[PDB]
From a paper:
Human bestrophin1 (hBest1) is a Ca2+-activated Cl− channel essential for Cl− transport in retinal pigment epithelium (RPE). Although the structure of hBest1 is still unsolved, two Best1 homolog structures, one from bacteria Klebsiella pneumoniae (KpBest) and the other from chicken (cBest1), have been previously reported. Overall, the channel is a pentameric assembly with a single ion-conducting pathway, which varies in diameter along its length and is constrained at two narrow points: a “neck” contributed by three residues (I62/I66/F70 in KpBest and I76/F80/F84 in hBest1/cBest1) on a transmembrane helix, and an “aperture” formed by a single residue (I180 in KpBest1, I205 in hBest1, and V205 in cBest1) on a cytosolic helix. Here, by electrophysiological and structural analyses, we show that the neck and aperture in hBest1 are both indispensable Ca2+-dependent gates, and their dysregulated opening by rationally designed or patient-derived mutations causes Ca2+-independent leak and elevates Ca2+-dependent channel activity.
Residue numbers in the entry:
A (entry chain B): 23 to 285
B (entry chain D), E (entry chain E): 23 to 289
C (entry chain C), D (entry chain A): 22 to 288
């Protein structure tokens, strides 16, 4: 939407020239000095705000990376400690894949039923969907398979420990994503500063014109671009899970985990 | 609160314009340039102040998230290692929920006793309220449960250590919240700066009135809106265990924890 | 504070400015704002980036002592769950943990801790303690001797023994933390120099202002000087966390809360 | 770099502006310096932050590739401390580990690991690997299959096995991090579009300085541009950590450091 | 070597006060406004640059702080688990101390042999020196001793693992140091910025003179001092493993660790 507000700045500059030669006549003066004070303060505050939003996105991407790492080492460990229990392979792998897809749907407020019925039996799908947090459930189920191998005596308490620790990695991951999606940390102010920048960009012409005249737009559209390009970054980073093509590519990540774990 | 000052600002602007004629006579010249120096100063400073307030608030949110995580897996580990012992599932889950709520009440400066006794017997509720470190007592009893199950031979030293770790995670969380509230040690500056930023925003029109005259208010109010809105940003994040709106949703969190662990146990 | 001296000084110096704006073109001294805005913003940028590190390390000290409390709390919990029985062994442990705390506080305030071990430990260990170069390291080797005596007894398996030793690491690391921050001679490479730089800046500022401001010089000069000197004092505070000033950490109350925690936990 | 190209452009632009100041009041239109101070400072701030992102990316990449050397070093250590005379395993595991390293280099440059693979392994498993979704991951799996092969045969307990499996975790987490920086980079976007805004700001700049600077415009408008153009080129050198350039990370050199190390550890 | 720059700067002020004349010629004027843009820009760039440099320095510090902690508690564990096996202790302590020296000698590219023979048996020194990576070779040899305690039954897999994990705090340290020592990162932007600050300063009076007249050699040396201080701050942090006086002492660090490791073995 930057080119709209840009080429609306062009308008407000034309207005600030065809309405410039009237200022003392009816009052009003305007100087660059306040607007570069304001401008520098806005440039400092944007940098700090973006630094937060960038942080959020970076943290989200790290959480989803740990999904992939943990779910890979758990299947590796099954294949290496119980090399010969493949009917447990499938059960665990499918609970893991279930869990990935199920998290994606959690973050998107979408229906996971569809995806669950492809990987798991309906007797599981209903138990899963019934929970106040189906992801946590799918983890509980993974833990079940892992501990039944223990009571079966196929896993020592040591090796049970090794693998259980990955359900721990996966839980620390679920809690993370809930933290970022459930609790936005003061993102309302992102609206505020947005407003602020726009207001700034549409006044700058009326202040620049005294020094720039017919050059007023050429300068006042450069400056605003540099400011509108910076605020825009906060808009494309602050929703790491959302529908927008820039947000984290969760469908594609999930496909990656499922393809990995299949073996 | 902010809009009180955004109006007071226009008071200072019209007061400046009416106050302008006696400037030359009375011997007062005021120029924007020092005030740009001051404004750019204050702005930098707020950026760093704010930067810190934000980090504190993130630590509190991350620390609470750790509760939800650690308890979820502690329960899970019970139901996976000792799936046929729900007499301990009940007691451990009830200690864990009581840990969360005890904490929430610690940080809110309120009586933790109601939620405490709703989920426990009286015989231990006493020993907890009768401690000066109640939330730490709850962890003592919750560990005592696992130690029991180990003496009983129902947990090996391996599988006991597994749950003991997650207790250690909760202990770190408790130390964390304790430190974060554990005084705002001489951070008086967040006050100082605020007091600064108000003064600035009120003196600003008396500097701007020469170079702007009848334009002065709108500009000043604009700047006072910009400096104030950012400044008040580090009032919110600075108290994170509060009764405020943008503050942490602790009550909702503990509710989520209870429903989580009750639902995991089958209740 | 020490700044409310500096504020009065600034007012004095701007008076000097107004009474000595006359000998200006004569002595050849022209002083304008615009070079001093460069100096001021350069300085503010630098203060932000300096305070940034100062708050970082003060925060680190905070987190280190909090970690002391957590680790010892849990080592006590672990004993009260794996060896519910041997309460007489524990006091010799809790006595070493409290000995460790106070020996840290005296290790940092650089004082003589002998009058404090005698309250916690028999005197045969005390001369052994003072004998070694670093007595906190020694108290740790001793509490380790306790846990490890319980190991050789058979009262602890290598698993449970491990569980406990790890917390003597959660503790050794805090030791080596406070050390690295103490022997860290406070990186005043820029800090004393920044404080100086800001002082000089603040006393000059009126001379660069008076040409443009006249009688209004002292007012604007002290607002600016305050804003800079207040953000600067923020470092005099957050740089001696192991000191005694009202800003520096309360290490005595902190050791004491450690003690009443451990005592309260040992019945 | 080809930066002295845009410096050249600024000299030439200064000559145009120097012999265009006459024409300038064509419509009484001027270009002051004040607004380009606004724009220049703002750009500088934004370069600070953006670069900060770029740098962080680079440093992390460097860290993960260091961890590779670290974890393989320990895993071979434990293979020599615990099974000090297995030898068959001593070579087989090291070949799988070198092959992991080289194959990670290939993975990030999207290049052909068949050649190094064949160099280190029998094609009996070169094919098991090349036919996998993520050959790096199949290689970690094969290493595991050797450590489990040794546990099965009882030559490692579940405890020593666990020790080594922690290190194959250390390696999995490395792979994951690199794969994230490459497959899921945070919005690259703004970087390139700053290089635009910076460039333009350089060329447009002397048209504003000439009015103040006369026949000094070339020598100064260049200095300024250099400053900006230098800081900005940081992003380029620090955003392709895995790519091919002098200024990039010498992954080949690193993989030969790793191989030389592990072959040193096995005589 | 900074005061060289300050004196030279005073000189060029004087030059500015006289050659200001011939600036009427053609048009070679220098304003304050362009240098205030450039100075503010340079202040920002310096800020972010020092930020990175500081971080690299702290990381070096803490790496070493972990040499201290890790070796300390490996010794204590050896005592509380194997208190009777002094003949082992003296060996493993020899290898830990030798690791510290060989690490420092590595980061200084100085020769280690003098310390190695002082601490280790000729036939081990020959091997360590024969390696291409002797610090790692030392960690390995420290391994064979612990792993032979395990091979003798004097250590169980649990306790062995509790020590093995310290050989890892160490391995992680040696890697971190090596990576910190293969820098420069961009290949030396921080040099480029240094020159940029030198030029900015030793052109600044030519731009101040038109306004400050004699007050030029004063305001100017103040400004140059501010920038040159903040920037000289980096050349100190960038080489933390260096011979120069601002860098970590290391030899002091290596001594502190040696005496710490002897005052824990009754030596
Ligand atoms: Zn399979
Ligand atoms: Zn249950
Ligand atoms: Zn019953
Ligand atoms: Zn009550
Ligand atoms: Zn955990
Ligand atoms: Zn702990
Ligand atoms: Zn340690
Ligand atoms: Zn007790
Ligand atoms: Zn071998
Ligand atoms: Zn892991
Ligand atoms: Zn001119
Ligand atoms: Zn000994
Ligand atoms: Zn390791």
């Amino acid at each position: 939407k930057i080119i709209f507000r840009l080429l609306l700045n062009v308008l407000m500059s034309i207005i600030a020239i065809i309405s410039y030669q009237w200022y003392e006549q009816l009052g009003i003066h305007l100087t660059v000095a306040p607007f570069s004070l304001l401008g520098i303060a806005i440039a400092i505050f944007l940098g700090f705000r973006n630094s937060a939003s960038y942080s959020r996105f970076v943290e989200a991407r790290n959480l989803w990376g740990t999904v992939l790492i943990a779910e890979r080492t758990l299947v590796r460990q099954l294949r290496n400690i119980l090399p010969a229990e493949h009917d447990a392979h499938r059960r665990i792998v499918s609970y893991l894949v279930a869990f990935s897809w199920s998290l994606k749907h959690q973050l998107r407020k979408t229906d996971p039923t569809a995806d669950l019925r492809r990987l798991l039996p309906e007797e599981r799908v209903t138990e899963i969907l019934a929970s106040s947090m189906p992801t946590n459930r799918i983890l509980l189920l993974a833990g079940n398979e892992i501990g039944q191998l223990r009571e079966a005596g196929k896993l020592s308490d040591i090796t049970y420990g090794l693998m259980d620790n990955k359900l721990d990695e996966l839980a620390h991951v679920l809690g993370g994503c809930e933290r970022l999606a459930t609790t936005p940390v003061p993102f309302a102010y992102t609206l505020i500063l947005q407003r602020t920048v726009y207001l700034f960009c549409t006044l700058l012409p009326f202040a620049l014109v005294g020094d720039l005249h017919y050059m007023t737009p050429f300068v006042s559209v450069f400056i605003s671009y540099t400011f509108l390009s910076f605020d825009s970054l906060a808009e494309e980073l602050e929703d790491p899970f959302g529908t927008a093509a820039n947000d984290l590519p969760l469908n594609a990540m999930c496909n990656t985990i499922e393809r990995n774990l299949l073996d």
